[PDB]
Amino acid sequence: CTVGPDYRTPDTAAAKIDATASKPYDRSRFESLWWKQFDDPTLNQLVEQSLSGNRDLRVAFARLRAARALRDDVANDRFPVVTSRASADIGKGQQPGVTEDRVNSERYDLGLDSAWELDLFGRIRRQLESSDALSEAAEADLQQLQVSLIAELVDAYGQLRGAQLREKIALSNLENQKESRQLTEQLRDAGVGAELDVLRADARLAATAASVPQLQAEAERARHRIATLLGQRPEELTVDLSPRDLPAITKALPIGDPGELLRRRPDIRAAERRLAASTADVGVATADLFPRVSLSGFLGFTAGRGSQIGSSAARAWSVGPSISWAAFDLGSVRARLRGAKADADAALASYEQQVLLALEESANAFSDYGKRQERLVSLVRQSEASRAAAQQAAIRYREGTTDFLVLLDAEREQLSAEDAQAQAEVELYRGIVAIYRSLGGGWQP
Amino acid sequence: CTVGPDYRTPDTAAAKIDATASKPYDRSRFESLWWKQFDDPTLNQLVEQSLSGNRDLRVAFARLRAARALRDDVANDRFPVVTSRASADIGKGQQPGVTEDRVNSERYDLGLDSAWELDLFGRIRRQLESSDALSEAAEADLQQLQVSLIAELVDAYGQLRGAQLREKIALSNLENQKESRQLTEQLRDAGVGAELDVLRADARLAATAASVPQLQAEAERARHRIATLLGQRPEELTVDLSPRDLPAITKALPIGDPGELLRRRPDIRAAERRLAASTADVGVATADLFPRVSLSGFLGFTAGRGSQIGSSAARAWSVGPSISWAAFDLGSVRARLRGAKADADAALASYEQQVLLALEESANAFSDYGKRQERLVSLVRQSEASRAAAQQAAIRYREGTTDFLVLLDAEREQLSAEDAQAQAEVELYRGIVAIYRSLGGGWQP
Amino acid sequence: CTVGPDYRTPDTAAAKIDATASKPYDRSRFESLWWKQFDDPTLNQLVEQSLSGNRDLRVAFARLRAARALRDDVANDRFPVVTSRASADIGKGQQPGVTEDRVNSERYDLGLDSAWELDLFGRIRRQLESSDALSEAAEADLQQLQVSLIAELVDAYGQLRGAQLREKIALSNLENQKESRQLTEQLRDAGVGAELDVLRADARLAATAASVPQLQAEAERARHRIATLLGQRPEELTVDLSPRDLPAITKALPIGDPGELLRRRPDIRAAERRLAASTADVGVATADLFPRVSLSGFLGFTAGRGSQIGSSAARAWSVGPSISWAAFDLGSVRARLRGAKADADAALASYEQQVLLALEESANAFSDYGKRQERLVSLVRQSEASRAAAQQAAIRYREGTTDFLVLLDAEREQLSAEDAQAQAEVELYRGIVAIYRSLGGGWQPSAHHHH
Ligand SMILES: CCCCCCCCO[C@@H]1O[C@H](CO)[C@@H](O)[C@H](O)[C@H]1O
Ligand SMILES: CCCCCCCCO[C@@H]1O[C@H](CO)[C@@H](O)[C@H](O)[C@H]1O
Ligand SMILES: CCCCCCCCO[C@@H]1O[C@H](CO)[C@@H](O)[C@H](O)[C@H]1O
Ligand SMILES: CCCCCCCCO[C@@H]1O[C@H](CO)[C@@H](O)[C@H](O)[C@H]1O
Ligand SMILES: *C(=O)CCCCCCCCCCCCCCC
Ligand SMILES: *C(=O)CCCCCCCCCCCCCCC
Ligand SMILES: *C(=O)CCCCCCCCCCCCCCC
Ligand SMILES: *C(=O)CCCCCCCCCCCCCCC
Ligand SMILES: *C(=O)CCCCCCCCCCCCCCC
Ligand code: NA
Ligand code: NI
Ligand SMILES: [Xe]
Ligand SMILES: [Xe]
Ligand SMILES: [Xe]
Ligand SMILES: [Xe]
Ligand SMILES: [Xe]
Ligand SMILES: [Xe]
Ligand SMILES: [Xe]
Ligand SMILES: [Xe]
Ligand SMILES: [Xe]
Ligand SMILES: [Xe]
Ligand SMILES: [Xe]
Ligand SMILES: [Xe]
Ligand SMILES: [Xe]
Ligand SMILES: [Xe]
Ligand SMILES: [Xe]
Ligand SMILES: [Xe]
Ligand SMILES: [Xe]
């Protein structure tokens, strides 16, 4: 007999995300190794190294091992606990009721001690049920950490490429600006220009030059995040992170059925497991409303004289059946039961919150990614127009048919447009990461 | 007697906030349902729904129940703990003292077991005092969560309106810029224009177009945050969140006496409660320096033969008065007492820190709100001048009395001014939230 | 005898930071009171007030005392625990074995009760070894908090000066802009200007005016962070924070040998101590594979009649030697051992992660600081050219040889350049803080014979 509530997984409705029945997405398959679709061998090597080197991941494997070991101890409580012991009780004094003389008093015991709770109401079955569930929670915590780590690492590689891309855009615009500064000097020196043109050109050149070490600095913080995520020291990175293009995915994104997301996400499973364990804990406490039946035992040797221990004349056995019940202390048992009920309500609510946070993450990731595609189309147009404008403004300044401010302003806009477009490409890549993170991709799924 | 210190709430001086004798503020009343002053029924519905749906709030209620359950168990220790038992000791072997033959031996007991610590030094009174205080702390944690949740939600609604406001500003500027692009093409096509004007107009149009999906993306993240704060899935959100104006409060802000803030804030009460509990815990530990006086009992039946249990010939009673005192183990008792004293100093320091954090939050909220009002006055002036400038620049460009860059730049400034003004209005709304959060507004007892 | 693994500090290689062999840095000495290099008495007073008033620091000191007190209780388990008792047993009923009559029964005891676990396999020595290490971890947590707090406070002072600097730049640019607005009005009113010029001038003035209360607002948030970090209420600040220059260090930075950073960082020591404690806990669990030997005792008086307690005829004593061993419960003991092994692997990995996070912080702080110096050189050039451009554009606008946009744009760029430069100066100062934070500056490593 196993008292208290029988846990049932909640009847959690599947995710509905309408925005996913469109062209950017392929619901017909899900790609578990979602980062491989970027077709970037360097990224793939980063991820592989991270799975064997990351120290947080190592901690989580260890915690999983700890939880199994806890469970394994609790499972032995289903059986009698048979220990060994050699003891004595030696003294001199009165023996009240028997005599008022001070007599010597000796007793020796050697053998097996047995302690056994008969699990008639399932206190122990429930403890094991809880511990098994906490083991499964720990496995899910590990899987979630893997999902989180892969996403963080892929994202950081993106940021690194972004900084590299933007540095290259900044240096390229710096050269255009150097050419222009040089033209303002030439015109001024030939008597058909102005110091005012050279000054403004210098100021703009220095502004653009100032962005370079900023961008390099962000690249270096990203390289350094990557090294830690790999379990590697900053100066000991194995993998060559020299500049390459920001990866892209041109096929529609294999996102599977978004209805499956709540079943795929390990954080959801972890919190469901904790709910199951907490529900079993109600059982544990509920069992204390009923009597506790135990059976102690001794098998070995008992004697008044040490010499006899081990011999036939000292053979002994004893059996200690016991039934106890809280009786007038039932109020206390009820208080602990209320406590366990409260903890299980906490766990339920906490599970529900994770479900909601997960649906929120996915809804954001999909809404973002679609908008980021739209935005990019406009930014690409801005860049094209800007490049063309600055080209023409350069020709006109050179020829004497437009003021320097026209060229200055067109150059500012070209840089500003090309930079924003790159940032937006990085955003798109990061949005891909957020989608897969939110779907629970990357643990074996 | 009740040993150890008698807790007294610290004499914490009232908050002094001088900036509040200004006319932005009404110290003559405080409005508990502070969000209702925005006169936004949609906001009011959100708040009411969140109080019944939010899952973090559910967790906190459950933790409150857990703490009451702990307290209820402790309270029973003021009374004797009277449990029930049926036991036996059955076996064969020597009986030291009595005989060296291996004899059969039986003993049966059935009745009530009684255990009572008498509480002469108040160890138990103090345990209960601590537990009651931790219950009040848990109630205050819940109330603080209510304050935090309401503030987060109101703030998020503000962000949502902000994104919607800014989208509308971006679309309105997009129309002006579309008209301009069209004018540059027209003038070019009519032989009094230039390709360079069309290109720059295209670039600027695309830039403005690009901002729209960004702002929509932010609107969607805010919609989704609102749904979770309500305890709802994103696609189930009941409330119509289609655009409306960012709410405003035109009367002076009813902020009450700022010297009441520390009494109103539940976080301060929670930390004060934990301090009270920790002070009682010093009492608990201090009691262990004194003797512990207890009284055990048995009432029921005892017999050498199973047959007799229940009969008057097996009636039994016993009574076990006992006094113990740590004696040579006083060093251990002292170490635990030092430990409890240390924990109480931690709690005191931690209470003081919450006081300081609260005064910091308050002082920031008031400093900010005044500055945000000032800043807005300038931004409103900037917007007006900018719109006028761009209107006139458009007239002049069309007429042939100013270059396109003059119109371009005036259009950029109009958008930049109108968007900054909107952001600043959002800031002002959020400043209102920060004031009320910091004053401890919005909780139920 | 002491059982289970004998802890050894891991053989952690020294930090390698190559970028530190260059001339921004002086590796020949380290300054532990690293903020004093700024030669700012106001900053020095803030830091001193913080060390005596900050409440987080007080919390952490208290937690350190709690952990020592826990350890002191555990230490007494190496010795017999000798308590005292006065008790009685009174009742009426059968005495199984002896009689089936219901007899009256009385008994009185007064004396010393003794309990002693003899630490033959070191279960207790190991518990103490763990507890001592957890105390050292708490000491190191406190020291790390001190490092973090000092850094936070110095950083905040920098942000405060930054806000004050930028306000001053904004007001100064506001004055230039007022002069220009006045010129647009004059030219318009004298028949050779344009309303369009006055309107754009007005818009820009309002933009610049709008920045002032924002910057003042940041100054006030900073003042308030500083007050809490000092343990002070916002309106009760002891130190005068009225505007002064952002401090600067002209000497190359005394950063010592970066290969001594992992030894100096308290967070690294804290994690190493938790590793040591965890390793000792393996010992504790390993001891349960062996027998446990105990010895109980009683010495005092026992009697059937209350009157006799205290007299020679009621003298009593007993001794309770005992040895137990898990026997068929060894699988449970093994499960606990595997558990403790798992926790020690967790702790090792956690120690290693802290090492890596520390190397990452250090490497970022040095990469940043170098880059921030370079960036500043360019921003200074931008400011100079911009100031000059705006002067010339003003001359040309006055002449009737440009539209006002030329002057407007030059003025925007001047403000934008001077503001960016100031932010970048603040960045450099904050990068100094990040270096010292990451090196473990601001606590006293050689205090307490070190260990
Ligand atoms: C008056 C004389 C009485 C004689 C009684 C027999 C003595 C018991 O002596 C016993 O001998 C064993 C080996 O033989 C040992 O293993 C036991 O531990 C020992 O105590
Ligand atoms: C208060 C915690 C630290 C004090 C350590 C010394 C013991 C203090 O114990 C004191 O002695 C008396 C006992 O009857 C009582 O009257 C006091 O109220 C009690 O607290
Ligand atoms: C009333 C009968 C009890 C016998 C005397 C009690 C001994 C109390 O003595 C205690 O021993 C502690 C640790 O060993 C010492 O540190 C304390 O100074 C002392 O309080
Ligand atoms: C683990 C050894 C027991 C140590 C108790 C030592 C108490 C002193 O702790 C000290 O406090 C200061 C701030 O409060 C820190 O700067 C010191 O570095 C720290 O050692
Ligand atoms: C809920 O109360 C269920 C109680 C179940 C008791 C189960 C006992 C199983 C042992 C079966 C052995 C049969 C003969 C073998 C003798 C050792
Ligand atoms: C759970 O208790 C519900 C009641 C119905 C289940 C029946 C199980 C019968 C068990 C009898 C146990 C007595 C054993 C005592 C040995 C010392
Ligand atoms: C100091 O001397 C304390 C004063 C209070 C009396 C102390 C004795 C125990 C009080 C517990 C209250 C309920 C006990 C009822 C017994 C059935
Ligand atoms: C391992 O088997 C332990 C052997 C137990 C023998 C008893 C030792 C008597 C105590 C010596 C005192 C030394 C003090 C050092 C304190 C760290
Ligand atoms: C310290 O002195 C080392 C003692 C040497 C060991 C012998 C003690 C016998 C007790 C039985 C322990 C069995 C361990 C089982 C593990 C697989
Ligand atoms: Na109780
Ligand atoms: Ni020390
Ligand atoms: Xe044994
Ligand atoms: Xe330029
Ligand atoms: Xe930088
Ligand atoms: Xe047994
Ligand atoms: Xe411009
Ligand atoms: Xe019972
Ligand atoms: Xe019984
Ligand atoms: Xe029994
Ligand atoms: Xe809420
Ligand atoms: Xe435009
Ligand atoms: Xe976007
Ligand atoms: Xe005593
Ligand atoms: Xe500090
Ligand atoms: Xe201006
Ligand atoms: Xe502001
Ligand atoms: Xe700050
Ligand atoms: Xe012993």
Side-chain angles (χ1 to χ4, degrees):
Chain A
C1 169
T2 302
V3 295
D6 297 309
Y7 176 66
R8 201 176 271 87
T9 296
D11 186 31
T12 291
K16 299 280 263 147
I17 318 176
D18 265 31
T20 76
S22 42
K23 229 209 265 146
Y25 312 111
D26 173 6
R27 313 148 115 288
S28 89
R29 209 186 28 92
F30 182 76
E31 181 52 85
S32 316
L33 309 176
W34 60 265
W35 61 95
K36 292 190 138 132
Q37 306 176 300
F38 283 121
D39 228 271
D40 190 301
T42 298
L43 175 57
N44 298 347
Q45 171 89 78
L46 292 173
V47 172
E48 215 55 45
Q49 294 227 47
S50 194
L51 297 171
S52 60
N54 184 281
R55 299 306 200 281
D56 289 326
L57 192 54
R58 205 159 288 177
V59 169
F61 270 102
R63 287 189 201 153
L64 171 59
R65 267 193 273 132
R68 291 185 174 152
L70 217 46
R71 177 247 118 98
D72 291 348
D73 189 1
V74 162
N76 294 340
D77 279 327
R78 292 172 301 166
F79 307 115
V81 182
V82 186
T83 54
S84 70
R85 145 197 148 245
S87 61
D89 182 1
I90 294 150
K92 197 170 188 203
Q94 300 189 20
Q95 261 112 58
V98 183
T99 177
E100 304 204 356
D101 291 327
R102 299 177 65 252
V103 286
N104 291 304
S105 216
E106 315 194 354
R107 170 181 179 135
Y108 301 85
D109 296 271
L110 169 73
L112 299 184
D113 285 310
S114 188
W116 188 26
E117 313 281 22
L118 275 76
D119 192 24
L120 300 180
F121 303 96
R123 198 189 139 73
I124 282 113
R125 265 179 308 291
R126 291 295 193 202
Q127 283 173 316
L128 183 53
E129 179 198 340
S130 176
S131 224
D132 280 328
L134 294 176
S135 215
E136 303 171 89
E139 182 171 13
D141 288 341
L142 166 56
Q143 286 165 350
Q144 174 61 22
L145 201 160
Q146 197 171 145
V147 165
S148 192
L149 157 78
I150 287 166
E152 189 188 348
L153 174 59
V154 178
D155 185 277
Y157 183 71
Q159 295 191 54
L160 168 72
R161 293 321 190 192
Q164 292 172 328
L165 169 59
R166 290 168 74 202
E167 173 178 25
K168 172 199 183 201
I169 287 166
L171 289 165
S172 183
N173 283 91
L174 187 70
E175 289 310 296
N176 301 333
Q177 289 171 34
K178 220 180 304 237
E179 262 164 67
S180 283
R181 200 253 310 260
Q182 204 211 194
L183 182 56
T184 65
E185 294 175 337
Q186 288 159 8
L187 292 181
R188 176 203 58 201
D189 291 346
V192 298
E195 190 60 14
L196 178 53
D197 300 358
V198 175
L199 290 172
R200 292 175 292 173
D202 279 331
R204 170 48 38 190
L205 226 216
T208 299
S211 77
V212 176
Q214 189 99 266
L215 295 158
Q216 296 167 340
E218 306 178 14
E220 291 304 302
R221 286 192 296 286
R223 169 201 266 258
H224 301 152
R225 248 298 66 206
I226 288 166
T228 306
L229 285 170
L230 267 58
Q232 295 176 17
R233 299 192 163 205
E235 80 289 354
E236 286 167 20
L237 257 179
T238 49
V239 181
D240 177 18
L241 295 173
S242 294
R244 291 181 186 79
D245 293 352
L246 184 65
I249 291 184
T250 46
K251 67 220 169 67
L253 294 190
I255 59 159
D257 177 0
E260 280 151 26
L261 84 79
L262 293 173
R263 283 167 306 244
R264 200 184 298 100
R265 283 179 66 125
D267 55 347
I268 301 309
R269 191 178 338 114
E272 188 274 332
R273 266 7 252 160
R274 292 191 170 87
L275 167 64
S278 199
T279 301
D281 296 340
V282 174
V284 172
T286 299
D288 290 342
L289 295 166
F290 297 89
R292 186 169 300 164
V293 181
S294 356
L295 181 63
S296 66
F298 176 72
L299 171 63
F301 305 90
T302 297
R305 297 288 221 192
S307 51
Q308 295 184 259
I309 294 301
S311 72
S312 299
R315 279 175 303 123
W317 72 265
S318 157
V319 143
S322 206
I323 311 174
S324 68
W325 183 58
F328 296 96
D329 198 38
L330 259 198
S332 289
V333 162
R334 284 184 176 122
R336 287 180 234 126
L337 172 58
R338 287 176 242 144
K341 280 171 169 170
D343 299 331
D345 292 344
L348 174 56
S350 187
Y351 164 82
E352 290 177 353
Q353 188 60 6
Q354 295 300 301
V355 169
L356 295 173
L357 292 161
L359 299 177
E360 180 182 359
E361 287 170 19
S362 50
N364 292 344
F366 289 107
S367 161
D368 283 352
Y369 177 74
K371 296 314 178 175
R372 284 170 192 184
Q373 284 177 330
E374 298 192 31
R375 168 152 154 106
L376 183 61
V377 169
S378 300
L379 293 175
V380 159
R381 245 188 310 285
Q382 183 193 5
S383 296
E384 271 163 43
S386 282
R387 243 170 256 123
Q391 274 139 47
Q392 277 230 68
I395 288 167
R396 299 217 359 223
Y397 178 61
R398 179 179 287 287
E399 279 175 18
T401 78
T402 204
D403 266 44
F404 180 66
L405 183 60
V406 169
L407 172 60
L408 172 69
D409 184 82
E411 288 184 326
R412 282 178 193 131
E413 295 306 292
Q414 184 190 293
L415 174 50
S416 156
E418 295 179 342
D419 192 69
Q421 174 182 334
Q423 283 182 254
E425 288 160 356
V426 171
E427 292 278 270
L428 193 74
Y429 172 104
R430 301 179 63 194
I432 293 166
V433 177
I435 286 172
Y436 284 101
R437 194 189 190 280
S438 79
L439 296 171
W443 60 273
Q444 271 154 285
Chain B
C1 74
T2 305
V3 124
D6 291 331
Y7 174 66
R8 291 232 334 182
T9 296
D11 206 343
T12 293
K16 265 68 229 300
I17 325 266
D18 276 355
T20 78
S22 295
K23 96 267 130 22
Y25 314 109
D26 173 9
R27 310 211 262 152
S28 67
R29 205 190 60 271
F30 182 75
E31 216 9 278
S32 260
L33 278 22
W34 60 264
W35 60 96
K36 307 247 275 216
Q37 307 180 315
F38 283 120
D39 256 298
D40 189 300
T42 298
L43 176 56
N44 299 350
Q45 167 182 353
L46 294 170
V47 175
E48 285 187 350
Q49 222 125 51
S50 85
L51 300 169
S52 61
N54 186 279
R55 301 302 201 284
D56 290 319
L57 195 58
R58 274 189 209 160
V59 166
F61 268 105
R63 292 187 196 156
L64 169 61
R65 280 184 243 123
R68 293 204 259 239
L70 281 188
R71 176 264 172 214
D72 290 350
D73 194 0
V74 163
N76 290 164
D77 287 349
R78 291 169 301 166
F79 308 115
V81 176
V82 187
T83 53
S84 69
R85 178 167 49 92
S87 58
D89 202 49
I90 290 153
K92 200 188 192 199
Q94 301 189 19
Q95 321 295 146
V98 185
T99 176
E100 298 182 45
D101 289 322
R102 288 188 43 259
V103 299
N104 298 313
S105 169
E106 297 191 12
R107 168 181 186 140
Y108 296 83
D109 296 272
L110 169 73
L112 306 185
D113 285 311
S114 192
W116 189 27
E117 187 191 333
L118 303 217
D119 214 25
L120 300 179
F121 304 92
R123 200 195 130 69
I124 292 160
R125 214 161 303 118
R126 292 297 191 201
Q127 281 174 313
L128 186 49
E129 179 197 342
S130 176
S131 264
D132 281 332
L134 294 175
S135 274
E136 302 172 284
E139 177 167 38
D141 289 340
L142 166 54
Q143 289 163 347
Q144 175 61 212
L145 197 141
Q146 253 182 107
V147 161
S148 191
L149 237 277
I150 288 166
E152 189 183 350
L153 173 58
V154 180
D155 186 279
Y157 184 71
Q159 292 192 44
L160 170 72
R161 295 320 192 189
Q164 294 174 326
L165 172 60
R166 287 170 73 202
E167 172 180 19
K168 162 193 152 71
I169 286 166
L171 290 166
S172 153
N173 284 91
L174 189 66
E175 283 299 289
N176 301 331
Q177 292 173 25
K178 210 160 196 149
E179 273 159 6
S180 271
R181 179 213 32 208
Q182 299 278 56
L183 181 56
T184 64
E185 311 199 355
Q186 287 168 1
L187 294 194
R188 178 202 65 200
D189 289 346
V192 286
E195 189 61 16
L196 176 55
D197 301 356
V198 177
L199 293 171
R200 293 176 287 175
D202 280 329
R204 173 39 46 182
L205 191 72
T208 300
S211 75
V212 174
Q214 198 160 242
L215 299 155
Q216 291 168 346
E218 201 175 311
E220 291 305 297
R221 285 193 299 287
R223 170 164 353 235
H224 302 151
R225 189 76 210 107
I226 287 166
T228 303
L229 288 170
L230 266 59
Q232 295 170 22
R233 304 181 156 219
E235 82 292 350
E236 303 180 332
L237 185 45
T238 32
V239 184
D240 173 20
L241 299 178
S242 67
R244 265 140 220 195
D245 291 353
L246 177 70
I249 297 186
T250 47
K251 72 184 208 299
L253 292 189
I255 60 162
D257 180 356
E260 326 265 26
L261 85 80
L262 294 176
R263 291 192 220 78
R264 202 183 296 101
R265 285 179 69 126
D267 56 349
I268 301 308
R269 181 178 334 119
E272 188 274 332
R273 270 359 259 166
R274 293 184 165 92
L275 168 62
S278 95
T279 302
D281 295 344
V282 165
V284 173
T286 298
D288 288 343
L289 297 168
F290 297 87
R292 180 171 293 162
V293 179
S294 58
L295 183 64
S296 65
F298 176 73
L299 173 63
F301 305 90
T302 297
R305 279 297 188 201
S307 74
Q308 319 186 259
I309 290 303
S311 72
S312 42
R315 277 182 304 152
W317 72 264
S318 47
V319 149
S322 206
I323 303 171
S324 69
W325 180 61
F328 296 97
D329 198 38
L330 263 184
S332 288
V333 164
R334 282 203 237 273
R336 290 182 289 280
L337 174 56
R338 283 180 244 134
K341 282 187 185 160
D343 298 326
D345 296 333
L348 173 56
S350 179
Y351 163 82
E352 291 175 2
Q353 183 60 188
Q354 282 292 311
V355 172
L356 293 180
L357 289 165
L359 298 178
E360 184 189 356
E361 291 171 12
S362 250
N364 291 347
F366 286 110
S367 105
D368 282 359
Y369 177 75
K371 295 313 174 184
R372 284 166 194 190
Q373 282 178 327
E374 292 182 43
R375 171 156 149 104
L376 185 58
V377 169
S378 288
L379 293 171
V380 163
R381 269 190 326 262
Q382 183 196 2
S383 294
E384 274 156 24
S386 281
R387 261 173 234 120
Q391 157 179 102
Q392 291 194 34
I395 291 163
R396 298 195 38 207
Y397 178 61
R398 183 168 70 237
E399 212 179 49
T401 69
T402 202
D403 267 38
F404 180 67
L405 179 61
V406 168
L407 171 59
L408 175 67
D409 187 82
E411 290 183 325
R412 280 176 201 140
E413 294 279 75
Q414 182 189 112
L415 173 51
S416 157
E418 295 178 337
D419 192 77
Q421 178 179 332
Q423 285 179 71
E425 290 162 351
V426 173
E427 290 266 272
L428 190 81
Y429 170 112
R430 302 179 64 190
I432 292 166
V433 178
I435 288 185
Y436 284 101
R437 193 189 189 286
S438 79
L439 297 172
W443 59 272
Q444 324 168 266
Chain C
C1 168
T2 301
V3 120
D6 301 304
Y7 176 65
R8 250 212 267 277
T9 299
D11 193 30
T12 291
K16 270 297 128 179
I17 330 261
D18 280 352
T20 76
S22 57
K23 101 287 257 287
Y25 314 108
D26 172 5
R27 312 212 292 187
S28 87
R29 42 175 288 266
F30 183 76
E31 204 20 279
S32 80
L33 313 169
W34 60 265
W35 61 96
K36 304 246 187 159
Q37 300 177 63
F38 283 122
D39 199 40
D40 189 299
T42 302
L43 177 57
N44 297 352
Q45 189 47 16
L46 293 173
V47 177
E48 288 313 302
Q49 273 304 320
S50 196
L51 295 171
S52 53
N54 184 279
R55 302 302 203 279
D56 289 322
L57 265 199
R58 275 184 208 160
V59 172
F61 188 48
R63 292 212 239 284
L64 163 63
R65 282 168 48 215
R68 293 303 294 163
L70 213 58
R71 170 268 169 214
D72 290 348
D73 194 357
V74 163
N76 288 350
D77 286 341
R78 292 166 308 157
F79 304 115
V81 177
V82 187
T83 53
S84 72
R85 175 171 52 93
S87 59
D89 291 301
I90 308 303
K92 199 184 209 301
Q94 295 192 25
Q95 261 111 57
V98 182
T99 176
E100 310 228 308
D101 289 320
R102 288 179 44 257
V103 300
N104 277 109
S105 215
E106 292 200 8
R107 170 172 186 137
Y108 301 85
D109 298 79
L110 168 73
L112 304 177
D113 285 309
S114 192
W116 188 25
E117 314 288 327
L118 280 77
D119 195 24
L120 304 183
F121 304 93
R123 203 191 131 70
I124 323 288
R125 273 187 315 288
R126 291 298 195 200
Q127 287 173 322
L128 179 56
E129 181 198 330
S130 177
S131 221
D132 274 329
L134 293 175
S135 275
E136 301 176 298
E139 183 175 51
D141 285 344
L142 160 63
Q143 290 151 350
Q144 176 62 24
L145 177 59
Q146 190 176 115
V147 163
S148 186
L149 261 272
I150 286 178
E152 191 182 342
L153 174 59
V154 178
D155 185 279
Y157 183 72
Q159 294 194 54
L160 167 72
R161 293 321 190 190
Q164 293 171 327
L165 171 58
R166 290 166 73 202
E167 170 179 10
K168 166 178 194 280
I169 287 166
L171 290 164
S172 167
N173 284 91
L174 189 65
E175 291 308 301
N176 304 328
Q177 290 171 27
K178 279 206 259 234
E179 265 179 274
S180 285
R181 151 173 78 183
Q182 209 191 218
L183 183 54
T184 66
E185 203 195 7
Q186 288 170 17
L187 291 184
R188 177 200 59 201
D189 291 347
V192 71
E195 185 60 15
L196 182 53
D197 298 1
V198 174
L199 293 173
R200 293 132 124 179
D202 281 331
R204 172 49 38 181
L205 262 191
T208 300
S211 76
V212 176
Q214 202 155 244
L215 297 157
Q216 293 170 337
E218 299 180 24
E220 291 302 299
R221 283 197 289 290
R223 288 175 183 256
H224 302 150
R225 246 300 64 207
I226 289 165
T228 303
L229 287 168
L230 269 52
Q232 299 177 10
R233 303 191 166 205
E235 82 290 354
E236 285 167 25
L237 260 171
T238 58
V239 183
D240 176 9
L241 294 179
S242 65
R244 291 169 198 283
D245 291 349
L246 182 68
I249 291 179
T250 70
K251 312 268 147 60
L253 295 185
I255 60 160
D257 181 356
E260 326 248 42
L261 127 204
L262 295 176
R263 291 158 214 141
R264 206 186 296 101
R265 285 180 71 124
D267 58 344
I268 301 309
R269 185 93 121 167
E272 189 273 335
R273 292 296 72 207
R274 292 194 206 270
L275 167 65
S278 194
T279 301
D281 297 336
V282 174
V284 171
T286 299
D288 286 338
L289 296 167
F290 297 90
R292 185 168 301 168
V293 177
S294 327
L295 184 73
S296 63
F298 175 74
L299 169 65
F301 304 91
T302 298
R305 282 153 52 238
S307 51
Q308 293 200 102
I309 292 300
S311 73
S312 311
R315 282 177 269 118
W317 71 265
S318 46
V319 130
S322 208
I323 158 170
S324 68
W325 178 62
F328 299 98
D329 198 39
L330 231 45
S332 287
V333 166
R334 283 206 256 260
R336 285 185 245 118
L337 176 56
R338 287 198 296 291
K341 282 194 189 168
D343 297 333
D345 297 335
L348 171 63
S350 256
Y351 165 81
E352 291 175 353
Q353 183 61 5
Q354 290 299 122
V355 171
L356 295 175
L357 290 166
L359 299 177
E360 182 185 355
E361 290 176 10
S362 230
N364 291 343
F366 286 108
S367 118
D368 282 359
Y369 177 76
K371 296 316 185 183
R372 285 167 192 192
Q373 284 182 325
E374 295 185 41
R375 174 156 147 100
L376 180 62
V377 168
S378 296
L379 292 173
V380 162
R381 193 188 301 103
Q382 180 194 8
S383 296
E384 275 157 7
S386 280
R387 238 167 256 131
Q391 284 179 179
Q392 298 269 90
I395 299 322
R396 299 248 315 257
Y397 179 61
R398 152 92 70 193
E399 180 183 27
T401 311
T402 37
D403 188 267
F404 179 66
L405 181 60
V406 170
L407 174 58
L408 172 71
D409 186 81
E411 286 184 326
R412 264 177 207 137
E413 294 301 284
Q414 182 187 113
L415 172 51
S416 163
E418 295 178 343
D419 190 78
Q421 178 183 329
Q423 284 185 73
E425 290 162 353
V426 172
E427 293 275 273
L428 211 250
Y429 169 109
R430 302 177 65 189
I432 293 165
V433 177
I435 286 171
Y436 283 102
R437 196 187 186 286
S438 78
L439 295 173
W443 69 291
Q444 294 304 146
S446 80
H448 300 162
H449 313 279
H450 319 253
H451 318 133

